[PDB]
Amino acid sequence: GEFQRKLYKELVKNYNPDVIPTQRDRPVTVYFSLSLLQIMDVDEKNQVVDVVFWLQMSWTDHYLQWNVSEYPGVKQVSVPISSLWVPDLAAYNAISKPEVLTPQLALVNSSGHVQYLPSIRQRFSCDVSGVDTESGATCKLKFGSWTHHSRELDLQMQEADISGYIPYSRFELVGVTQKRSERFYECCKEPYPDVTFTVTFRKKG
Template sequence: RLNKKLLTNYDTNVRPVLNHSHPVEVQLALTIQNIIDLDEESDVLTMYTWVSYLWTDEYLNWNESEYGGIKSIRFRDDQIWHPDIHLYNKRSYEPIDTFMIVYSSGTVSFVSPMVMKSNCAVDISNFPFDNQTCILTFGSWTYDGSKVSLKSVAPPGLHTYTMNNEFELTNATHKVNWKQYQCCPEPYVDVTYTLELKRRTDHATHFIMSPCIICSLLIPFIFLLPHGTNDKILYGAPPDILHNVFLI
């Protein structure tokens, strides 16, 4: 009965405000579960994240006492309006299907878990002691700031973060920006998260520097062997094999 009451004459294409001169205020929150990979060759950062949205739908509210004390109800994302927030610098992302929770006050909560791939320009000039900065920019694709006002009250959440073996996440910040693009006269709002990553030197030392040092120490002894002896091949092969074993 409540579902029918809420969805009767409901239009998913119309912003859920009674006064259409008012924007829909959307709170965005990013929780980073773990960094899966930072590919230096393709400049792609892969993470598993939870992206949370919170807004008020002024058409979806009810008196709990009239509906058996029901405090919340769930809808699929194709049943009600939701903001078209996208990661602007994405390579790809794989959202996991979930429901939106609507509370009796009209507050809508949507938490979307996803594997996210984004562009991240990698500078390895100081490898293996390099630091990388990756930026994630979220914003509405079609609504300007007067229609959807995007807000973020906190930097990325790290309370459930799982450590990455190659990179340490040293800092994570956020900033709300109002920007004007050449295509459109109205300003658009985005939330930009900045992630600072530091390569773990123990990983690089173990897999790269140590084999190189060992090989460098072994190779000069080859020149001490008599000229023309086949032992040079015998003693020259192990350093190369050792290096390849460390890289596997």
């Protein structure tokens, strides 16, 4: 509609997608969770697990807000992530580049809340030696901001979800636990937060 056009113009001026949208003191809080969809493969020789999953990232970008009074009907807009600042979350123990399976777009409402919900295929380092046993094998999928510490970027866990796991896989999904951690490094002076998704699974039969 004619109003979305008007809005793109206003929101786009001065906007810089390379600059994390902090405000005086307040870090950007980034809510994060992972839903396991499928375990594509297990490589018992090179110790790697190949998985497809869905990620929810949401946060508030205060530069991306508007009064609905000035833009009737416009409650939300779809925005290519290349035009937005987005959390630089990385899988700390990945051994392959993430392959994003879905359109690289984010939903953004009038409050400047942003939802990026990408589906991803990625391989990880893991001891899968236990996959053929009753105890199964346990893989940690550990994520955190690559370059923003806790006081710029405040990573928080959202309630996880296992309802998405495909029933006909050859791998039974035993469980998925979720943990938020925070540590300093001898390197930098600020602490860094991470979220680890611990997945346990075994071969059916």
